[PDB]
């Protein structure tokens, strides 16, 4: 079987705290003696549209920030700002601090989200960074500060922090540097996600996973050039397939003996005919939230 | 906004996962208090997969024939016994990471989270449901025998499933934590197959309600719906009471869907219980 799997969230659960400034409360990420959270926590109801974060932060003292790790209150001894993330220095290092690093992911890459409310983890799920730099996540009010991550070798790579929900229902956030994915800004002025597309390299990887698990009904005797595939796939609103993407599919092609452009011909036919009542790995749609690395890891 | 197949945070279960080795077999074990639980098939050999005598195989083994690895530490086994299809290994050290837990047995149509582990090392977590045919459509890529399923109510972990084997149809079968199998399956490498599976109708209705909350209202009598749907499981009064837009109006929507996408899915998802919708949408 093939499941959309999230990484074990235990190493991240031990880092989620509750940050309060004024009457605003959201989640923070406690690593070493620093707590990371969205800088919009310092905004009031009149600072939602055009806040000057430099002016708002200079008016704050350390005792204006209430950091709460479970039932233990953490004393803030310093505060600074980097891009859209607020850094709260506390007098206690987190003893549960795992091996970690901050990374920025590319569109199409996947990660796991630990949805938290009031610093309390409530659920974990797997998702991908859409080509339009949005997240088709599952967030309610109080989830800002939740983080996305991958685990590579018992080291936690933090790549996402949730900041806001867009009017279309999707979500936008930053890396742990405070830099937003996409052209979005931490302001409550109407923003809209660009035109989203299907992650082509992920669908091909998912098709390779279907062959690995024993499904071959979708293959055909055809091949295609890289340009002719892109000409057809882009008409179905698929992201263009680059030569780097083809190289990434290398190991899966060798493991299955099916050339990438041969699998491209299969995908071109699947888009043309649909499923015809059949399923691939339990899905009736072409799933695009598995990277070629996710396929190899689970298989 | 949004709707995802959300699993419970797995941190409380990760601290319990250990590696159990017996002979040429290595799988996952659940370390709770001073007892490690794992499938009793761990004591089988290569030549004892078709018709093993577990009573005979266990009597011939001593405590030191079981090697339990908890991180970089080897736990010392001081006792071994069997409860149904689960082996219970008594160790000399209580697990300091033992959470508040209880062993429960779930019903078909209920959901839970699985922490898929590989030889004691956790690798991934996902959410799934107990199919009416008592099978699990999970992802178990070997070395995952002994992985457990659970739910979390308040701070209490309700262990409900332990994985034992995969069926020839790609689905998986297991037991509860007391060793009692879900479904008509035995722990032997024999000819067995999963029964005709049916769709959990009450979960589909709950999933349609989650779509109305998320902005999908384009498709917005009991006995009449059942006769058409049964052409899927039947709906009871408790189903409508648990799903308490009237329910019968939603059944007419589902009836108009079975004959003649929703939340990014071309299929009617049936692995979200009515409480899962409330837990995620509130
Ligand atoms: C608020 C939020 C998010 O705050 C927020 C701030 C902002 O600019 C200052 C713009 C937008 O769009 C948003 C949001 O979308 C809000 O979701 C999140 C959370 O969790 C809390 O508690 C809060 O008060
Ligand atoms: C074996 C297994 C599972 O062992 C197993 C035993 C059995 O009867 C004794 C029947 C079947 O069907 C199975 C399986 O399907 C195997 O998956 C699991 C794991 O993880 C290991 O390591 C192992 O040796």
UniProtKB/Swiss-Prot annotation, chain A:
Record annotation: effect of changing residue 89 to R: In strain: Beta/B.1.351
Supply the source organism for this entry.
Severe acute respiratory syndrome coronavirus 2 (2019-nCoV)
The record gives the effect of mutating residue 144 to A as: Complete loss of 3C-like proteinase nsp5 cleavage
Catalytic site residues?
Answer: 40 (for 3cl-pro activity), 144 (for 3cl-pro activity)
Which ranges make up the Cytoplasmic topological domains here?
A: 1-299
Role of this protein: Cleaves the C-terminus of replicase polyprotein at 11 sites. Recognizes substrates containing the core sequence [ILMVF]-Q-|-[SGACN]. Cleaves and inactivates human TRMT1, preventing tRNA guanine(26)-dimethylation of tRNAs. May cleave human NLRP1 in lung epithelial cells, thereby activating the NLRP1 inflammasome pathway. May cleave human GSDMD, triggering alternative GSDME-mediated epithelial cell death upon activation of the NLRP1 inflammasome, which may enhance the release interleukins 1B, 6, 16 and 18. Also able to bind an ADP-ribose-1''-phosphate (ADRP).
Q: Which reaction does it catalyse?
A: TSAVLQ-|-SGFRK-NH2 and SGVTFQ-|-GKFKK the two peptides corresponding to the two self-cleavage sites of the SARS 3C-like proteinase are the two most reactive peptide substrates. The enzyme exhibits a strong preference for substrates containing Gln at P1 position and Leu at P2 position
Q: Where is this cross-link: Glycyl lysine isopeptide (Lys-Gly) (interchain with G-Cter in ubiquitin)?
A: 4, 89
Compartment(s) where it occurs, according to its Swiss-Prot or TrEMBL record: Host cytoplasm; Host Golgi apparatus; Host nucleus
Name assigned to this protein? 3C-like proteinase nsp5
Binding partners and assembly: 3CL-PRO exists as monomer and homodimer. Only the homodimer shows catalytic activity. Interacts with host FBXO22; this interaction promotes the proteasomal degradation of nsp5.
Activation/inhibition comment:
Inhibited by pyridone-containing alpha-ketoamides compounds 13a and 13b. In turn, alpha-ketoamide 13b (tert-butyl (1-((S)-1-(((S)-4-(benzylamino)-3,4-dioxo-1-((S)-2-oxopyrrolidin-3-yl)butan-2-yl)amino)-3-cyclopropyl-1-oxopropan-2-yl)-2-oxo-1,2-dihydropyridin-3-yl)carbamate) inhibits SARS-CoV-2 replication in human lung cells. Inhibited ex vivo by michael acceptor inhibitor N3. Inhibited ex vivo by compound 11a and 11b.
* Full-protein positions shown: 3265 to 3563 of 4405
User: Domain named Peptidase C30: which ranges?
Assistant: 1-299
- Phenotype upon changing residue 131 to H: In strain: Omicron/BA.1, Omicron/BA.2, Omicron/BA.2.12.1, Omicron/BA.2.75, Omicron/BA.4, Omicron/BA.5, Omicron/BQ.1.1, Omicron/XBB.1.5, Omicron/EG.5.1
């Amino acid at each position: 079987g093939f499941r959309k799997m999230a990484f074990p969230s235990g190493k991240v659960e031990g880092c989620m705290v509750q940050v309060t400034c004024g009457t605003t409360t959201l989640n923070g990420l406690w690593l070493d003696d620093v707590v990371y959270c969205p800088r919009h926590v310092i905004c009031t109801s009149e600072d939602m549209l055009n806040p000057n974060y430099e002016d708002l932060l200079i008016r704050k003292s350390n005792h204006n920030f209430l950091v709460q790790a479970g039932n233990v209150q953490l004393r803030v001894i310093g505060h600074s700002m980097q891009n859209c993330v607020l850094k709260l220095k506390v007098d206690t290092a987190n003893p549960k601090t795992p091996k970690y690093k901050f990374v920025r992911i590319q569109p199409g890459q996947t990660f796991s989200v630990l949805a938290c409310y009031n610093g309390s983890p409530s659920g974990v799920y797997q998702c991908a960074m859409r080509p339009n730099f949005t997240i088709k996540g599952s967030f309610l009010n109080g989830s800002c500060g939740s983080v996305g991550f991958n685990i590579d070798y018992d080291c936690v790579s933090f790549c996402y922090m949730h900041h806001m929900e867009l009017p279309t229902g999707v979500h936008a956030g930053t890396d742990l540097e405070g830099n937003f994915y996409g052209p979005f800004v931490d302001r409550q002025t109407a923003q809209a996600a660009g035109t989203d597309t299907t992650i082509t390299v992920n669908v091909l990887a998912w098709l390779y996973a279907a062959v690995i698990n024993g499904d071959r009904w979708f293959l055909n005797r055809f091949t295609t050039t890289l340009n002719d595939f892109n000409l057809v796939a882009m008409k179905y609103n698929y992201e263009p397939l680059t030569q780097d993407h083809v190289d990434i599919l290398g190991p899966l092609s060798a493991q299955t003996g099916i050339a990438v452009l041969d699998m491209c011909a299969s995908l071109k036919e699947l888009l043309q005919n649909g499923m015809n009542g059949r399923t691939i790995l339990g899905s009736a749609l072409l799933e695009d939230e598995f990277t070629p690395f996710d396929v190899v890891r689970q298989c």
